[PDB]
Amino acid sequence: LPQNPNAGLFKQGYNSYSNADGQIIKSIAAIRELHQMCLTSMGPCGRN
Amino acid sequence: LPQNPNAGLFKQGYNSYSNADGQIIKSIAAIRELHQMCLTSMGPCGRNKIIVNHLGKIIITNDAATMLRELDIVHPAVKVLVMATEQQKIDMGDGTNLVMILAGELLNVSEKLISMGLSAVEIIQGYNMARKFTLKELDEMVVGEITDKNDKNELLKMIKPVISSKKYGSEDILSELVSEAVSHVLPYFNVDSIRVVKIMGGSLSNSTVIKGMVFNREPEGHVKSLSEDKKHKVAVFTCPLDIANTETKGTVLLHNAQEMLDFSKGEEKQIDAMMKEIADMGVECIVAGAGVGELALHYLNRYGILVLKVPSKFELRRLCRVCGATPLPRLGAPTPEELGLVETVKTMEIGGDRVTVFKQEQGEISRTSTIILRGATQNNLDDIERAIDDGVAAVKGLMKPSGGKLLPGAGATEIELISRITKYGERTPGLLQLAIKQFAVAFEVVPRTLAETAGLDVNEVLPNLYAAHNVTEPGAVKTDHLYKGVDIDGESDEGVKDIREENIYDMLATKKFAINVATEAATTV
Amino acid sequence: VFMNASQERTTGRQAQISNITAAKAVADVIRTCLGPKAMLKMLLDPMGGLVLTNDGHAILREIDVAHPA
Amino acid sequence: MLVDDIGDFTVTNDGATILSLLDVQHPAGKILVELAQQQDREIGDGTTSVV
Amino acid sequence: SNATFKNKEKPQEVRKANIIAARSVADAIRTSLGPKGMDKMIKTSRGEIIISNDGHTILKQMAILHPVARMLVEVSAAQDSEAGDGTTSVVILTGALLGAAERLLNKGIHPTIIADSFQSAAKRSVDILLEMCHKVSLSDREQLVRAASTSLSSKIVSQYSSFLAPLAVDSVLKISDENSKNVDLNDIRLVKKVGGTIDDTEMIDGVVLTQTAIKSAGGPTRKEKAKIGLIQFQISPPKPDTENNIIVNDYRQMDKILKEERAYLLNICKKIKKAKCNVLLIQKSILRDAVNDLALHFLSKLNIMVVKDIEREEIEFLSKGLGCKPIADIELFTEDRLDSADLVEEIDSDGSKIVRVTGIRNNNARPTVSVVIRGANNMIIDETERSLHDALCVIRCLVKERGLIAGGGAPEIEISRRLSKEARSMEGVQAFIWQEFASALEVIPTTLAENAGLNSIKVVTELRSKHENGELNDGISVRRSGTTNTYEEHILQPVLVSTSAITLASECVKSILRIDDIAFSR
Amino acid sequence: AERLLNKGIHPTIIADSFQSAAKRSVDILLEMCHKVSLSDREQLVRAASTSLSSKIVSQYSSFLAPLAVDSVLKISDENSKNVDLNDIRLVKKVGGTIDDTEMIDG
Amino acid sequence: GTDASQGKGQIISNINACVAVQEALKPTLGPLGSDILIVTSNQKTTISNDGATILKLLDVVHPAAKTLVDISRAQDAEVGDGTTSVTILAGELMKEAKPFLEEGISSHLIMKGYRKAVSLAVEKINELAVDITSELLERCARTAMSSKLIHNNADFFVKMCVDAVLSLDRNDLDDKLIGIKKIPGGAMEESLFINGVAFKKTFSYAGFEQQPKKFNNPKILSLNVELELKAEKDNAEVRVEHVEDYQAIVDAEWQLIFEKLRQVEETGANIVLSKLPIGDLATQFFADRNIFCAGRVSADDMNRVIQAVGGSIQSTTSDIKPEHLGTCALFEEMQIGSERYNLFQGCPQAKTCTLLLRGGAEQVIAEVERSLHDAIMIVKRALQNKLIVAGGGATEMEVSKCLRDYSKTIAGKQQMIINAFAKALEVIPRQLCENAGFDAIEILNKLRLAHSKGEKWYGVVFETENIGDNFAKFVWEPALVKINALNSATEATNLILSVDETITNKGSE
């Protein structure tokens, strides 16, 4: 028994699209990942 | 690197589409495959092809409706013309080949018409309007005196061609047994009653027909059975011969010694009581049809009474219709108005097999008879019963008025029709002319197919027949056993009319379905 | 597409000759046993058949031939 | 929050119930889990702390 | 955002997936949307061949798993179970409905706008419809056969279509009574026989059974004037509903106890023999030919044609035709609740015996009918029976409601024209797309010409060229490339359908316009 | 082309409809153009700032627009005539921002 | 066995997982919230906007995400209309409350800070209150109808719903006594609303077709008994020592069967509804009493007919009473075409209300009742609690400008909490504008000014241009809803905010 949603517009192999607003929320966080790691590094009384 | 064409419109799993014109070219050939295999099968001077069941059993036939019966096809189109032959062999005995032969050819010739420019709808109406003209024209093309049915005179004349078709060379002797087993049924008549029993040993020519059915079984009661009588009166009944067993819950309970010491005796009493009661009635033979009790079998052997073991529920009937008696549930309470007289119930053995019989009648004469076929090959003896059942079906049609109308077979009619069908389309305006002139030449099968069988130069046989429209009957045909073209009238060879009509219809019906379909959506697995 | 895949067919002189010359096989084996200078055969079917009967039937039963002809 | 390795969750601050959902591999650890569930019997609270 | 392992669907792409899918079902179905349609062969897994032209058939035989497509079917399916016809013509309407709705939508128009445009035109198109129908009297042979030969055609049996058309109406008519009123297409038995061709079928003013009566010494072949007893008790030795042990005290008691059962046979056979009711029809199974009962044969020893294992649904179809109260049990039996039939012939083929109650009833007006659907091959008695379901029900939608619509796409051409003409009625940029629904409705007419061969644009144009003042009824003739009207060809199509179909199409595609995501799962 | 084609119109019909309109549309085109003099700073920068925009550097589009035209102009000579965009070297440096680029007369 | 993420490094993965679910509901809001075709297993396939069913048939891996999708049905049962909104609020409630976690001292200062929020907000949510007459409910029941595919016939349903509610008819109406058949076909305007019970029950009396098609003034007997030769409950076995005690036993069978209906016809019955089928014998002995009999009726069904008819279901006919038979007007088994169906209506002061619908495919119909329920229920919410709130997101913007006021008026380091709760409630109307934009943002500040000195009401229209005024517009959401939707939205976040570690295995040990 079914079912299965077809694919709207095909392409080669595999490619990754990203809706802009969604990407901004999503990529603004990726960015945010390396932030909390660079925060503690800056300044004298910090960490390495 | 690329590339790859996507899929225009998807669906579930896998499915197979078929453009209609392409399918017609493609499926008209599938059909054509089983054609060249059915061509060589039809007619006497032909051939028979072996087939090995999916279970391993071996089968040899001339009949094309059986070839397919043992054949597992896949082609939904071919499936049709196979359903045809099969959907005929049941309704009408013979004519199963003229089905495929025409059907296939109709499709074959229609191709030309489909390629020329015609359309399937145009092709259908074309052929159809011919089926109505070919069916009627034949209703009068007969000229074969509808002989009245009596004795073996008219029977042997008709029953032979029905047989000489596949089992050629034994036509005479064969049909003899057929007509024989027939005239033992006092004339509405049932075809089913004439059963057949073949047993290995000797050549087929040593077969015989006895008034009454044969049982490949020994008389129960051990060495206490007679197995030999003279003009004994029989009495057949279903209910178990043993004690009256509880159909529902039932056992045997005893409380005191007197009970036990007597319960063993009580049985013996009832037993003898039941038996002697039926024995005094003059019953010389009890044909048990269901269940046999050794407890009470003690009685029956001593007086001098036979006992035929319990056959199949369906075989008791055809048996009873021989004896004259009548079956009756419950043991005892015999009724002389339900008793039947049997001539002889001896125990003869053919091929070294213990067998009981009902052969010959002084006598009351059985209403059903069986043919005893001696042979040397399990396969042949089987494709002899077939050539028989065909006959038994030919006598089934002649027995229902007014189908007893003869007709110039042996190609004769199937050749005259060529022209007669041509004229119709020769004088019918429109595009349907072509679709008719085709349906006509379609009947080129039966003619050529006979010639090509004997090694006869087909390029001569056809022209000869065309010249010989003689209209004497005709009056014109082809016998593989002569020179040039033979004469149907002479050989006394004529194919029953109604069978041809059924064949000419079922083919024009099936061939139309195959033509009618445009797209075939086949599934998987 | 018919025919079904797969089931062997010999159309032509094939079966016409590869059935006679194939029947000849079993008919070539027994063709030694007969008469005063007889040639009795022995054969072990599945399991220890170990049966030696010169009865042409008894012999042709053990060959258990599979060929139609 | 403890995951029933089948998606199912369970949020809790209780120390006793939390240690039970851990599985307590080893004698020394399970010994504390055992000491935990003892505390509820004595009291009912502090299981988180006694350990 | 997504717990993974799932199949969401981008907004703008969704509509494509929806439309492109939905629009495509019609691509396969349009080959049957017309009397000049194309017949298909459906080879199933097992190998069983079904020949049909019926959209629904195809839709139920073929494997459909589509999220969009699978829905389009669940509507025409519900449309057949209710309306009873116009199966395919519904999938099509959704096709061109989205086809046209997408066009304007692909260029800016909001989905929710056309989504209003839908119901907007829906109502107003249901208006013209209720104004396009024709009042029809009751009980008119020619006026009904005119509707039968309209549906019972477009079938494989085109040569013989006027052969089933009569057999179709005659039976229905024999069912419709005025209680009041109420037809019961379920109360007209249809048993298929295997003989002759698809033709050679015989409409029967009565009931034809599959039951049999196998008695060599008994089993009467015919009944000139046989009374009928509608009963339903076991023709066999039953057993207590509690644990059962019958114990024989003595060895003799054995024979003596074997009568304690036969007593439970004659117990009812007696009350039945006294009534001397002749032919009997026990709903209880014997079944067919094989015992039980042995004593059952004794019941026919008194020369009493009786067949058991009757169909439950055909027992009610018996009381009305027979006109005899089917006594469930015999405790309060009588002799009044019997019936009669001029003839009963249990003709048997090969080993199968079909009991026919020919010339039966005549009394009580013979309310239940039965058409014999003869035919050699199976694939034939497959479509033929599939056509009557769409044939009887068809003509019974006129008798059901006193409304009929001119065929050849009358409201189809008309509704679009009304929509195309005056659009002021409603306002807003919404109605601006009621033109979509408009041009949409022309979906049936177009393909109709297409299925014939004659250019779909020229023919439909030849209708956009006929104007005047008066009855003004026009339609396309699939026959010639011309435009012969339906008002004269007697080729019409029921309202119960057009209304309950034009509401179905625009009730799905409107949901489709609405949807943003069609998230899937595993 | 599919819309009308999906409803009956032949592919070869619209296939003609194509070239049909093609020619006539090439006509209006040759009639929609404007005669323009030669060597006009403002009239060229008006075309540069039209293409050299719609770029990521929208804030700075009027920054590349000049650098775009000035160079080209310095290439176009009247032999006769012939420009050679291949004969204006473009070497990318890694410093500052996308801006801070300098048109070079050399 | 397995690892675990703890601390802020995980505290986050809890929050952004929350926002995640709400992201899939933004489209659904009343205005132009587009239907979502969700394919599910086994082969289920639904389509609509009803949160607690669009999320229900949508599985989620994460813990937090699994807590949110729970509030959906956690809310739908309580009021049954705040489906789409509660999720959209619960989520956004953390997004604008997150940067106060790290920058904020602790996750617990925010907890207390949320109580002073929900308390005050529920207050402001009570200020905008309206009174329900208890005809005019048709005004509010219109709103539940409006979002889903009921707008096309907003009128037809509002009545079909407040009517079904009207029949029962108790201080508390249990929609368990309000069956909802859903026939396919016809027209959506063809969805009558019987005052009895509709049954797929075909021509009753399976013996023969003799039983009356329908009866005027039927006196019904609804039974849970079997009405067939009873078997010894105590495992008994028979011993036929006699010779003809077999026939006598066979008789004892048909006997008890007659004695069965004998004492059941004594109640002058002319129609009986037995939960269980009836033996052919007992099917005839009563049939001669011209009484109808329908068997196989569902357990729940025979309770709807228990209030409609009026007769009490009784077992063991021997102790039958006159108070067991009922009074209903008629029983006509009209065919739905190809399929039968026995209808039974009438009877004064009857609670049961079966509202059969019509329209399109079984799926279309589904989404109809799906939203119909949202209506039927929305009226009980307003009926059990007769007071309403200023809808259109106005109520939301109100508690937002009110809390916002409390913001500055707070002296503490936990000020940044109440603030968050406020800012998040403004987002409730946000999408109302974003679903009909562009653009939502400009209209925001418009309401802030109006609320300040523009009186409580006045929100965003869903027409929609932008700003409007709901009392004038006519969109009033029963306070009961908005009340709990906010409460459900805040508390769940609080439990989730209380979490700082996630273990990835269970004993359960």
Ligand SMILES: Nc1ncnc2c1ncn2[C@@H]1O[C@@H](COP(=O)(O)OP(=O)(O)O)[C@@H](O)[C@H]1O
């Ligand atoms: N002398 C003959 N006797 C019988 N049949 C003959 C004779 N000569 C030719 N035939 C052929 O045998 C018949 C047909 O062969 P048959 O295998 O029976 O086809 P089918 O049974 O399908 O009709 C004749 O109609 C004819 O073509």
Ligand SMILES: Nc1ncnc2c1ncn2[C@@H]1O[C@@H](COP(=O)(O)OP(=O)(O)O)[C@H](O)[C@H]1O
């Ligand atoms: N005295 C004999 N001299 C030569 N051959 C003989 C003699 N007696 C018998 N035979 C041959 O042996 C017999 C044939 O038997 P055969 O079928 O070959 O095997 P088996 O004897 O086992 O059945 C015949 O009688 C004959 O051909």
Ligand SMILES: Nc1ncnc2c1ncn2[C@@H]1O[C@@H](COP(=O)(O)OP(=O)(O)O)[C@H](O)[C@H]1O
């Ligand atoms: N004689 C006709 N000429 C043109 N169109 C017809 C004609 N008869 C019927 N139609 C149209 O086609 C039918 C609908 O779908 P179809 O598959 O062709 O047959 P049906 O739905 O009755 O089984 C309608 O009756 C009508 O809209």
Ligand SMILES: Nc1ncnc2c1ncn2[C@@H]1O[C@H](COP(=O)(O)OP(=O)(O)O)[C@H](O)[C@H]1O
């Ligand atoms: N046209 C509207 N504009 C603003 N708010 C509305 C409008 N219609 C309804 N609402 C309110 O917003 C609410 C929250 O949405 P909900 O009913 O839970 O799911 P949905 O709005 O998608 O049906 C209600 O629908 C209602 O009380």
Ligand code: BEF
């Ligand atoms: F070929 Be026929 F059928 F003998």
Ligand code: BEF
């Ligand atoms: F968790 Be507490 F300590 F009980």
Ligand code: BEF
């Ligand atoms: F073919 Be119709 F639409 F039933």
Ligand code: BEF
């Ligand atoms: F989702 Be809404 F309440 F219909």
